[PDB]
């Protein structure tokens, strides 16, 4: 369908399809690897500005700024003229939304992959019929958390809602809408295997951040990581939230390595009720050999009797 407009590099003497083609970049030729006949010479291997048409689309606009000799009134008139443009109103509002997303992620000092994934999620999830009535803050929070979960750098709900003053209702519904529409777009476009990237719990990623907020050593972080990994085997704690199971595993490993911090300080820092931590410690107190890392007690750095009684 339509014009072909395609050039195939076929050797006219060997008549072998597909031909073995060698691109001699140093000598600037395209040659046939069988006979050595050249195919295209004078090949072309800065002057413009980079613009990827996947993050913001095929938007092509330039602003007006002060030069060497600049009158202020002309600049104000040109800025007002650029303001009253009706064709790029959708482009202007999605650029303002991108600026707000990158400012809000940048005040959160998250990496650039989070901002890129949030921007592309916002672009591919914009102008949808099923998502029109939700407030913009919920859209931004859902895009931010989707971008966090895309790059194995996933965050939690409480620290997202600490920055964006949004309720749990519309944030959860917007998250579900985003997940459904992104899976639909992936099925329509390039299909992607999940392989545990938007997993619901993802409690293995919340260990070192809370350990660093508590100022624990990295061996305690690895021990709590092993404990959180082995909590999947226990059926009595499977329904618990990832945050609470991470907190109780961290507290269990603190009591294992005799780190001199209190449960009240852990509850104050990590915003968890001490009753939940005590209940998790009590239900994990019976599971001793199923949580303590076997090479840690093989090395003798920890022992089972360091845990206080219940």
Binding stretches for Zn ion (CB under 5 A): 11, 14, 32, 34-35
Q: Which is nearer to Zn ion, 22 or 81 (CB)?
A: 22
Q: Is 208 in the site for other proteins (CB under 8 A)?
A: yes
Dihedral (Cα; 181, 183, 189, 195), 10-degree rounding: 160
Q: Which is nearer to other proteins, 106 or 127 (CB)?
A: 106
Contact 151, 112 (CB under 8 A): no
Q: Helix/strand/coil (H, E, C) string of 42-111?
A: CCCCCCCCCCCCCCCCCCCCCCCCCCCCCCHHHHHHHHHHHHCCCCCHHHHHHHHHHHHHHHHHHCCCCC
Can you tell me the distance from the alpha carbon of 117 to that of 113, in angstroms, rounded to the nearest whole number? 6
- Cβ partners under 8 Å of residue 125, min gap 6: 131, 139, 143, 178, 181, 182, 185
Q: Is 199 in the site for other proteins (CB under 8 A)?
A: yes
Quote the least distance from Cβ 137 to other proteins, whole Å: 12
Q: Between residue 30 and residue 89, which ones bind other proteins under the rule CB under 8 A?
A: none
Answer yes or no: is 11 a known binding residue. yes
Q: Is 135 in the site for other proteins (CB under 8 A)?
A: no
Can you tell me the distance from the alpha carbon of 81 to that of 45, in angstroms, rounded to the nearest whole number? 40
Quote the least distance from Cβ 108 to other proteins, whole Å: 4
Tokens of 212: 């660093």
Binding-site size for other proteins (CB under 8 A) equals 53
Can you tell me the distance from the alpha carbon of 232 to that of 248, in angstroms, rounded to the nearest whole number? 14
Q: Which helix (H) or strand (E) holds 30?
A: strand 29-32
Answer yes or no: is 117 a known binding residue. no
Q: Which is nearer to other proteins, 95 or 161 (CB)?
A: 161
Which one of 115, 149, 150, 155 is in contact with other proteins (CB under 8 A)?
155
14 binds, among Zn ion, other proteins, none (CB under 5 to 8 A by kind): Zn ion
Q: Is 263 in the site for other proteins (CB under 8 A)?
A: no
Binding site for other proteins (CB under 8 A): 1-4, 107-111, 113, 151, 153, 155-160, 162-163, 165, 168, 172, 175-176, 179-180, 183, 194, 196, 199-201, 205, 208-209, 212-215, 232-235, 238-243, 269-271
């Amino acid at each position: 369908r339509g014009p072909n407009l395609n050039i195939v590099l076929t050797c006219p003497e060997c008549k072998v399809y597909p031909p073995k083609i060698v691109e001699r970049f140093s000598e600037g030729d395209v040659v046939c690897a069988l006979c050595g006949l050249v195919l295209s010479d004078k090949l072309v291997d800065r002057v413009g500005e980079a613009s990827n048409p996947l993050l913001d689309g095929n938007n092509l606009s330039t602003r007006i700024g002060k030069g060497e000799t600049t009158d202020m009134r002309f600049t104000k008139e040109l800025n007002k003229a650029q303001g009253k443009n009706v064709m790029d109103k959708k482009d202007n509002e999605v650029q303002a939304a991108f600026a707000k997303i990158t400012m809000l992620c940048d005040a959160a000092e998250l990496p650039k992959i989070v901002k890129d994934c949030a921007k592309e999620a916002y672009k591919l999830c914009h102008d949808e019929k099923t998502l029109k009535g939700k407030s913009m803050e919920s859209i931004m929070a859902a895009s931010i958390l989707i971008g966090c979960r895309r790059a194995e750098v996933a965050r939690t709900f409480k620290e997202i809602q600490s920055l964006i003053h949004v309720k749990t209702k519309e944030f959860g519904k917007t998250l579900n809408i985003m997940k459904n529409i992104l899976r639909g777009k992936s099925e329509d476009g390039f299909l992607k295997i999940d392989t545990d990237n938007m997993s619901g719990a993802q409690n293995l990623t919340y260990i070192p951040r809370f350990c660093s907020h508590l100022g624990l050593p990295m061996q305690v972080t690895t021990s709590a990581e092993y404990t959180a990994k082995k909590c999947k085997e226990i059926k009595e704690i499977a329904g618990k939230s990832p945050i609470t199971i991470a907190v109780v595993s961290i507290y269990l490993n603190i009591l294992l390595f005799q780190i001199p911090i209190t449960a009240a300080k852990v509850g104050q820092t990590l915003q968890v009720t001490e009753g939940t931590i005590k209940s998790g410690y009590k239900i994990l107190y019976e599971h001793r050999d199923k949580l303590v890392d076997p090479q840690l007690i093989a090395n003798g750095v920890v022992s089972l009797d360091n845990l206080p009684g219940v």
